[PDB]
Protein backbone atom coordinates (compact mmCIF):
# COMPACT_ATOMS: atom_id res chain seq x y z
CA UNK A 1 0.00 0.00 0.00
CA UNK A 2 1.51 3.33 -1.22
CA UNK A 3 0.18 6.56 0.43
CA UNK A 4 -0.37 9.71 -1.68
CA UNK A 5 2.52 11.97 -2.63
CA UNK A 6 2.33 15.53 -1.30
CA UNK A 7 1.93 18.55 -3.53
CA UNK A 8 5.21 19.16 -5.32
CA UNK A 9 6.30 21.85 -7.76
CA UNK A 10 8.59 20.82 -10.58
CA UNK A 11 8.89 21.32 -14.38
CA UNK A 12 6.17 19.68 -16.43
CA UNK A 13 7.43 16.62 -18.36
CA UNK A 14 7.59 17.42 -22.06
CA UNK A 15 5.83 14.72 -24.03
CA UNK A 16 7.22 15.94 -27.37
CA UNK A 17 10.86 16.52 -26.28
CA UNK A 18 13.14 13.51 -26.05
CA UNK A 19 14.83 13.10 -22.69
CA UNK A 20 18.27 12.60 -24.30
CA UNK A 21 19.19 12.73 -27.97
CA UNK A 22 22.48 10.97 -27.49
CA UNK A 23 21.63 7.78 -25.65
CA UNK A 24 19.07 4.98 -25.27
CA UNK A 25 16.97 5.57 -22.16
CA UNK A 26 14.71 2.45 -22.23
CA UNK A 27 15.51 -1.15 -23.11
CA UNK A 28 13.44 -3.25 -25.51
CA UNK A 29 11.67 -4.89 -22.53
CA UNK A 30 10.75 -1.42 -21.25
CA UNK A 31 13.22 -1.14 -18.34
CA UNK A 32 14.62 2.37 -17.86
CA UNK A 33 18.27 2.96 -18.60
CA UNK A 34 19.41 5.35 -15.85
CA UNK A 35 21.30 8.38 -17.17
CA UNK A 36 21.53 11.87 -15.70
CA UNK A 37 18.45 13.94 -16.98
CA UNK A 38 16.09 10.91 -17.01
CA UNK A 39 14.96 11.27 -13.43
CA UNK A 40 13.59 13.82 -10.97
CA UNK A 41 15.23 12.77 -7.71
CA UNK A 42 12.76 14.77 -5.63
CA UNK A 43 9.83 12.66 -6.90
CA UNK A 44 11.75 9.45 -6.44
CA UNK A 45 13.01 10.36 -2.92
CA UNK A 46 9.40 11.01 -1.89
CA UNK A 47 8.18 7.73 -3.28
CA UNK A 48 10.91 5.78 -1.51
CA UNK A 49 10.85 7.61 1.79
CA UNK A 50 7.10 7.11 2.00
CA UNK A 51 7.85 3.36 1.81
CA UNK A 52 10.50 3.67 4.51
CA UNK A 53 13.05 2.10 2.31
CA UNK A 54 16.15 0.47 3.71
CA UNK A 55 19.13 -0.19 1.43
CA UNK A 56 21.86 -2.69 2.11
CA UNK A 57 25.31 -2.06 0.57
CA UNK A 58 27.54 -5.11 0.51
CA UNK A 59 31.27 -5.18 -0.07
CA UNK A 60 33.97 -7.88 0.19
CA UNK A 61 37.25 -6.59 1.46
CA UNK A 62 39.82 -9.43 1.74
CA UNK A 63 43.58 -9.25 2.29
CA UNK A 64 45.00 -5.99 0.87
CA UNK A 65 41.54 -4.74 -0.19
CA UNK A 66 40.84 -3.70 3.43
CA UNK A 67 42.94 -0.61 2.69
CA UNK A 68 40.17 0.72 0.36
CA UNK A 69 37.48 0.66 3.04
CA UNK A 70 38.06 4.06 4.55
CA UNK A 71 37.69 6.07 1.27
CA UNK A 72 34.86 3.77 0.09
CA UNK A 73 32.80 4.27 3.28
CA UNK A 74 33.57 8.01 3.70
CA UNK A 75 32.46 8.75 0.15
CA UNK A 76 29.40 6.46 0.48
CA UNK A 77 28.41 8.70 3.42
CA UNK A 78 28.51 11.76 1.18
CA UNK A 79 26.85 10.32 -1.92
CA UNK A 80 25.06 6.97 -1.42
CA UNK A 81 21.34 7.02 -0.57
CA UNK A 82 21.70 10.16 1.59
CA UNK A 83 18.46 10.61 3.56
CA UNK A 84 17.44 6.98 3.42
CA UNK A 85 18.15 4.09 5.82
CA UNK A 86 21.48 2.39 4.86
CA UNK A 87 22.99 -0.83 6.24
CA UNK A 88 26.53 -1.48 5.16
CA UNK A 89 27.73 -5.06 5.22
CA UNK A 90 31.45 -5.42 5.14
CA UNK A 91 32.65 -9.01 4.60
CA UNK A 92 36.30 -9.27 5.50
CA UNK A 93 39.04 -11.63 6.74
CA UNK A 94 40.38 -8.77 8.92
CA UNK A 95 37.60 -7.46 11.13
CA UNK A 96 40.00 -5.51 13.33
CA UNK A 97 41.37 -3.65 10.34
CA UNK A 98 37.98 -2.17 9.35
CA UNK A 99 38.38 1.61 9.82
CA UNK A 100 36.23 3.53 12.28
CA UNK A 101 34.18 5.68 9.88
CA UNK A 102 31.68 8.15 11.19
CA UNK A 103 28.17 7.57 9.83
CA UNK A 104 25.15 9.82 9.40
CA UNK A 105 21.99 9.17 11.33
CA UNK A 106 19.93 6.17 10.20
CA UNK A 107 22.98 4.42 8.82
CA UNK A 108 24.70 1.39 10.19
CA UNK A 109 27.57 -0.92 9.56
CA UNK A 110 27.99 -4.63 10.23
CA UNK A 111 31.36 -6.39 9.92
CA UNK A 112 30.97 -10.07 9.00
CA UNK A 113 34.11 -12.17 9.25
CA UNK A 114 34.85 -14.55 6.46
CA UNK A 115 37.24 -17.51 6.40
CA UNK A 116 31.97 -18.85 4.46
CA UNK A 117 30.74 -16.78 7.45
CA UNK A 118 28.47 -16.81 10.55
CA UNK A 119 25.84 -14.68 8.74
CA UNK A 120 22.50 -15.99 7.65
CA UNK A 121 20.84 -15.09 4.27
CA UNK A 122 17.46 -14.67 5.99
CA UNK A 123 19.12 -11.81 7.88
CA UNK A 124 19.03 -9.73 4.66
CA UNK A 125 15.34 -10.49 4.17
CA UNK A 126 14.51 -9.09 7.57
CA UNK A 127 16.93 -6.10 7.62
CA UNK A 128 16.83 -4.48 4.21
CA UNK A 129 14.47 -3.96 1.25
CA UNK A 130 17.15 -3.75 -1.45
CA UNK A 131 20.68 -5.03 -1.75
CA UNK A 132 23.41 -3.31 -3.71
CA UNK A 133 26.59 -5.32 -4.24
CA UNK A 134 29.73 -3.41 -5.27
CA UNK A 135 33.49 -3.59 -5.51
CA UNK A 136 35.42 -1.95 -2.60
CA UNK A 137 38.37 -0.52 -4.56
CA UNK A 138 36.12 2.32 -5.68
CA UNK A 139 34.89 5.69 -4.46
CA UNK A 140 31.74 7.69 -4.77
CA UNK A 141 32.14 11.08 -6.41
CA UNK A 142 28.52 12.08 -7.09
CA UNK A 143 24.94 11.14 -6.31
CA UNK A 144 23.98 7.44 -6.24
CA UNK A 145 20.42 7.24 -4.97
CA UNK A 146 17.02 5.64 -5.12
CA UNK A 147 16.85 6.10 -8.92
CA UNK A 148 18.71 2.75 -9.05
CA UNK A 149 16.24 0.78 -6.96
CA UNK A 150 14.13 -1.86 -8.67
CA UNK A 151 13.69 -5.63 -8.40
CA UNK A 152 16.81 -6.42 -10.42
CA UNK A 153 19.44 -4.14 -11.94
CA UNK A 154 22.76 -4.42 -13.78
CA UNK A 155 25.26 -1.77 -14.81
CA UNK A 156 26.83 -1.22 -18.21
CA UNK A 157 30.53 -2.09 -18.40
CA UNK A 158 32.23 1.20 -19.04
CA UNK A 159 34.66 -0.33 -21.54
CA UNK A 160 31.94 -1.81 -23.70
CA UNK A 161 28.83 0.40 -23.61
CA UNK A 162 29.38 1.46 -27.24
CA UNK A 163 30.45 -1.95 -28.47
CA UNK A 164 28.66 -4.42 -30.70
CA UNK A 165 27.65 -7.67 -29.05
CA UNK A 166 30.20 -9.64 -31.06
CA UNK A 167 32.96 -7.62 -29.31
CA UNK A 168 31.62 -8.31 -25.80
CA UNK A 169 33.90 -10.62 -23.80
CA UNK A 170 31.14 -13.03 -22.82
CA UNK A 171 32.04 -16.70 -22.31
CA UNK A 172 32.10 -18.13 -25.81
CA UNK A 173 32.76 -21.86 -25.17
CA UNK A 174 29.53 -23.93 -25.55
CA UNK A 175 30.77 -26.28 -22.79
CA UNK A 176 30.32 -23.51 -20.17
CA UNK A 177 26.99 -22.83 -18.46
CA UNK A 178 27.94 -19.12 -19.05
CA UNK A 179 28.05 -19.59 -22.85
CA UNK A 180 26.54 -16.82 -24.97
CA UNK A 181 26.79 -17.08 -28.75
CA UNK A 182 27.70 -14.20 -31.02
CA UNK A 183 24.08 -13.48 -32.12
CA UNK A 184 22.81 -13.14 -28.51
CA UNK A 185 23.21 -10.46 -25.88
CA UNK A 186 21.65 -7.11 -24.94
CA UNK A 187 24.47 -5.37 -23.05
CA UNK A 188 27.72 -6.22 -21.33
CA UNK A 189 27.19 -5.79 -17.63
CA UNK A 190 30.03 -5.47 -15.11
CA UNK A 191 29.88 -7.33 -11.84
CA UNK A 192 31.22 -4.41 -9.89
CA UNK A 193 27.79 -2.80 -9.30
CA UNK A 194 24.52 -4.78 -9.35
CA UNK A 195 21.54 -5.20 -7.06
CA UNK A 196 17.84 -5.46 -6.62
CA UNK A 197 15.34 -6.69 -4.07
CA UNK A 198 16.88 -9.14 -1.57
CA UNK A 199 14.85 -11.95 -3.14
CA UNK A 200 16.07 -11.14 -6.66
CA UNK A 201 19.71 -10.73 -5.64
CA UNK A 202 19.60 -14.07 -3.77
CA UNK A 203 18.05 -15.74 -6.83
CA UNK A 204 20.88 -14.36 -8.96
CA UNK A 205 23.73 -15.41 -6.65
CA UNK A 206 22.15 -18.89 -6.13
CA UNK A 207 21.91 -19.37 -9.93
CA UNK A 208 25.44 -18.13 -10.47
CA UNK A 209 26.80 -20.45 -7.74
CA UNK A 210 25.09 -23.49 -9.29
CA UNK A 211 26.34 -22.64 -12.80
CA UNK A 212 29.90 -22.11 -11.47
CA UNK A 213 29.79 -25.53 -9.72
CA UNK A 214 28.53 -27.24 -12.89
CA UNK A 215 31.43 -25.74 -14.87
CA UNK A 216 33.91 -26.82 -12.15
CA UNK A 217 32.57 -30.42 -12.43
CA UNK A 218 33.01 -30.24 -16.21
CA UNK A 219 36.57 -29.08 -15.84
CA UNK A 220 35.95 -25.56 -17.03
CA UNK A 221 36.27 -22.04 -15.53
CA UNK A 222 34.61 -19.15 -17.46
CA UNK A 223 36.82 -16.32 -18.86
CA UNK A 224 35.90 -13.43 -16.47
CA UNK A 225 34.40 -15.84 -14.02
CA UNK A 226 31.78 -14.05 -11.90
CA UNK A 227 31.17 -11.51 -14.75
CA UNK A 228 30.47 -14.13 -17.42
CA UNK A 229 27.93 -15.90 -15.23
CA UNK A 230 26.34 -12.55 -14.31
CA UNK A 231 26.03 -11.74 -18.01
CA UNK A 232 24.39 -15.08 -18.77
CA UNK A 233 21.92 -14.65 -15.92
CA UNK A 234 20.96 -11.13 -16.98
CA UNK A 235 20.54 -12.25 -20.57
CA UNK A 236 18.00 -14.87 -19.49
CA UNK A 237 16.38 -12.83 -16.65
CA UNK A 238 16.14 -9.27 -17.93
CA UNK A 239 16.95 -6.53 -15.38
CA UNK A 240 14.11 -4.19 -14.50
CA UNK A 241 16.52 -1.26 -14.64
CA UNK A 242 19.89 -0.88 -16.34
CA UNK A 243 22.40 1.64 -14.97
CA UNK A 244 24.55 3.72 -17.33
CA UNK A 245 28.31 3.75 -16.87
CA UNK A 246 27.91 6.89 -14.79
CA UNK A 247 27.52 4.28 -12.01
CA UNK A 248 30.78 2.35 -12.60
CA UNK A 249 33.54 4.33 -14.29
CA UNK A 250 37.37 4.50 -14.52
CA UNK A 251 38.44 8.02 -15.33
CA UNK A 252 42.14 6.98 -15.60
CA UNK A 253 41.40 4.39 -18.29
CA UNK A 254 38.45 6.13 -20.01
CA UNK A 255 38.55 9.85 -19.30
CA UNK A 256 35.36 11.91 -19.06
CA UNK A 257 33.41 11.69 -22.36
CA UNK A 258 30.62 14.17 -23.17
CA UNK A 259 27.98 11.43 -22.91
CA UNK A 260 28.70 11.20 -19.13
CA UNK A 261 27.21 14.20 -17.43
CA UNK A 262 28.23 12.85 -14.04
CA UNK A 263 30.84 10.38 -12.81
CA UNK A 264 29.22 8.85 -9.76
CA UNK A 265 31.19 5.76 -8.66
CA UNK A 266 34.76 5.30 -9.90
CA UNK A 267 37.89 3.25 -9.72
CA UNK A 268 40.52 4.36 -7.26
CA UNK A 269 43.66 5.12 -9.39
HG1 LIG B 1 14.54 14.13 -19.45
HG1 LIG C 1 20.46 -18.92 7.97
HG1 LIG D 1 25.34 -8.87 -2.50
HG1 LIG E 1 29.67 -7.51 -5.24
HG1 LIG F 1 26.63 -13.85 -10.54
Amino acid sequence: FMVSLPRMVYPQPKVLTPCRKDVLVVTPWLAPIVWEGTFNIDILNEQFRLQNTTIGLTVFAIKKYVAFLKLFLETAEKHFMVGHRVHYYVFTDQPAAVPRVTLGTGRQLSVLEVRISDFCERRFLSEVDYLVCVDVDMEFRDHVGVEILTPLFGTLHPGFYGSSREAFTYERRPQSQAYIPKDEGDFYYLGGFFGGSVQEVQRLTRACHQAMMVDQANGIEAVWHDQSHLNKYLLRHKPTKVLSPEYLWDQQLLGWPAVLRKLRFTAVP
Side-chain angles (χ1 to χ4, degrees), residues 119-120 122-123:
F119 178 85
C120 144
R122 300 157 215 148
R123 227 187 108 196

Side-chain angles (χ1 to χ4, degrees), residues 3 21 27 34 50 90 108-109 124 131 142 145 154 178 218 222 228 265:
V3 301
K21 280 208 148 105
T27 74
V34 187
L50 291 167
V90 173
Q108 77 164 293
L109 187 143
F124 291 139
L131 275 174
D142 211 330
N218 290 150
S228 302
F265 183 61

Side-chain angles (χ1 to χ4, degrees), residues 57 72-73 76-77 86-90 103 107-110:
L57 181 56
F72 173 87
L73 291 167
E77 282 299 301
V86 172
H87 197 149
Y88 301 97
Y89 304 88
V90 173
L103 308 182
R107 306 173 73 99
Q108 77 164 293
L109 187 143
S110 299

